């Protein structure tokens, strides 16, 4: 039911590039920011700003006039382990800005480094919502 994704370059799934997840209606997605110990001098530390882009933004790694700002991995030294961000794959959202999800469609996510990549290659995640026939 719940899907856990650790957002870091050290992860073997992200290194492939073709990292995709098959999700159903009313399912959850948990994104974990890269957590580092106090001994780290914050130089090797990774910090990313997440964006929800389209198919054009997925291949070109651009978020300007193509996507919207989602979450930010600003402080790596969080008290209760890594920073957790929740995303529900609901059909209808009660919140005014809250993102809706449709069955049998693809949704894309990208991340840009704060210090940087230089528009060469970005850490990307492909999200596909399975139709009503596939989900029970």
């Amino acid at each position: 039911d719940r899907y856990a994704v650790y957002w870091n370059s050290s992860n073997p799934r992200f290194q492939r590039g073709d990292y995709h997840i098959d999700v159903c209606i009313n399912d959850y997605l948990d994104v974990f920011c890269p957590h580092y110990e106090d001994s780290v001098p914050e130089d090797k530390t990774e910090r990313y700003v997440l964006y929800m882009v389209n198919f054009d933004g997925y291949s070109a790694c651009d978020h300007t006039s193509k996507g919207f700002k989602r979450w930010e991995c600003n402080r790596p030294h969080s008290p209760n382990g890594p920073l957790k961000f929740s995303e529900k794959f609901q059909l209808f959202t009660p919140f005014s800005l809250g993102f809706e999800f449709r069955p049998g469609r693809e949704y894309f996510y990208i991340s840009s480094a704060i210090p940087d990549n230089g528009r060469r290659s970005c850490l990307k995640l492909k999200v596909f919502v399975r139709p009503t026939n596939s989900c029970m």
Binding site: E72, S86, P94, F95, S96
Partner: protein
């Protein structure tokens, strides 16, 4: 952002809110969406409009009162119109219930679903999102609800969904406060509001360290979070001015002796400037001020000795005469002290003071009259009297450097009448005069007096000139008029006698 102190906030939370939801699955969800600019918030959403029967609970963490009476809750929420969404009417709702429970236990494991106290069923006022299908626009509805009075240590908050599609954006938990203000020279501290919106708190604030409470200072703490019109005024202490709302010290060259509404007055004439925050401007060397004298008065000088002295002797008594002193200094209170020395008898300076009971008819010492009389004296003895000019400040000031004195003898007779008088130069405007010293002086001759009165005419005013020399003249006299003159000898002994009536007619 406001002056109100916050207790619980969705923005201020360290990482996750961590709120207990009953049921856990299919209930309230911690779906977090970022708000502009760079602000992470924990958003609680629920949309179970389809299912027939709906019951939902969302309990907040421990909220401490921190000495508060009434707490104001501000909830930011997004809704969905039941007609705009497909489904049966009634299953979907547009209202949600709010609950609160008072507790003393810090970390409570579980709070009963029945023990909660309902506040109000909240709906989105004024407008609510449907939401519009064409374009997506954020809501601007924020609902406020008050809760009080509170008795226990703290409280817990809950939310109830009756089948609505609701998204709780931000939950602001604050309590209304009166600011720390210094009005009417008195300090007033930060105070909590009353148990009700009608309630007011009487705040009696203490005055500044360099001030004294003339009237009891008090104010009223309004429920809105603002101070009311002051009752009672405070005035700054002596040597401190009532400027800038806080007690300030008097500048270098300024003073304040009494706690009055007036500012620090400048140092009076001839007064030395003291340091910052002076009670009274100190008197510089050579100038002083009396203990019973006012602080506003300038520094006064001691008096000079009276310049002229006239002495007259009797068989057993003596009379002394003197005029006003040259320099008063400033003070009007001038008295005269008569001191007996008895140094006249004998040539050396070393002498014995007047130990015997010397009686005085006007006053012994501190005489306000310009004339003194000594009733008793010893015959054949040489005495010396010192007329001391005493001021009201002369005691506080150093003893006067000099005092005009005269050496006189009791037994010695007054000088006799002058033998002859002769006019040396007679003109139409001026008449010169020359005379001999009396046959029997009985002491050293000090002064000569000449009388001037009209003859063969009406009794005029007899003019008397004072000359130490035996030769004198007159300026401004009418021609062809007869005048009579009299020369009188004056010594330390006393009053002499009139001379030969010399009839001299103008040329």
């Amino acid at each position: 952002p406001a002056n109100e102190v916050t207790l619980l906030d969705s923005r201020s939370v360290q990482g996750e809110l961590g709120w207990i939801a009953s049921p856990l699955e299919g209930g309230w969800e911690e779906v977090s969406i970022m708000d502009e600019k760079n602000t992470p918030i924990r958003t609680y959403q629920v949309c179970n409009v389809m299912e027939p029967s709906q019951n939902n609970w969302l309990r907040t963490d421990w909220i401490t009162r921190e000495g508060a009476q009434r707490v104001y809750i501000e909830i930011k929420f997004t809704l969905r119109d039941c007609n705009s969404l497909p489904g049966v009417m009634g299953t979907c709702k547009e209202t949600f219930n709010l609950y609160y429970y008072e507790s003393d236990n810090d970390k409570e494991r579980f709070i009963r679903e029945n023990q909660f106290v309902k506040i109000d069923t909240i709906a989105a006022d004024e407008s609510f999102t449907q939401v519009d299908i064409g374009d997506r626009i954020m809501k601007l509805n924020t609902e406020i609800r008050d809760v009080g009075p509170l008795s226990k240590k703290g409280f817990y908050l809950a939310f109830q969904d009756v089948g609505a599609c609701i998204a709780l954006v931000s939950v602001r938990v604050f309590y209304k406060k009166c600011p720390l203000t210094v009005r009417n020279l008195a300090q007033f501290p930060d105070t909590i509001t009353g148990a009700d919106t009608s309630s007011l708190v009487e705040v009696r604030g203490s005055c500044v360290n360099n001030s004294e409470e003339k009237d009891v200072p008090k104010m009223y703490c309004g429920a809105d979070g603002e101070w009311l019109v002051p009752i009672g005024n405070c005035l700054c202490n002596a040597g401190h001015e009532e400027r800038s709302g806080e007690c300030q010290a008097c500048k270098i060259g300024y003073y304040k002796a009494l706690s009055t509404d007036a500012t620090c007055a400048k140092c009076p004439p001839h007064s030395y400037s003291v340091w910052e925050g002076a009670t009274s401007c100190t008197c510089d060397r050579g100038f002083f001020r009396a203990d019973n004298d006012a602080a506003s008065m300038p520094c006064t000088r001691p008096p000079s000795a009276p310049l002229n002295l006239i002495s007259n002797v009797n068989e057993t008594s003596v009379n002394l005469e003197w005029s006003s002193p040259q320099n008063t200094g400033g003070r009007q209170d001038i008295s005269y002290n008569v001191v007996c020395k008895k140094c006249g008898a004998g040539d050396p300076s070393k002498c014995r003071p007047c130990g015997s009971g010397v009686h005085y008819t006007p006053q012994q010492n501190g005489l306000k009259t310009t004339k003194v009389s000594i009733t008793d004296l010893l015959a054949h003895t040489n005495y010396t009297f010192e007329i001391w000019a005493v001021n009201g400040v002369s005691k506080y000031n150093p003893n006067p450097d000099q005092s005009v004195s005269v050496t006189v003898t009791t037994n010695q007779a007054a000088p006799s009448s002058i033998a002859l008088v002769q006019a040396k130069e007679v003109t139409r405007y001026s008449v010169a005069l020359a005379w001999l010293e009396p046959d029997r002086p009985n002491g050293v001759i000090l002064e000569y007096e000449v009388k001037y009165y009209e003859k063969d005419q009406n009794e005029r005013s007899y003019r008397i000139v004072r000359t130490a020399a035996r030769n004198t003249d007159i300026k401004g006299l009418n021609p062809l008029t007869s005048y009579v003159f009299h020369v009188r000898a004056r010594t330390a002994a006393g009053y002499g006698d009139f001379s030969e009536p010399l009839e001299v007619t103008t040329n």
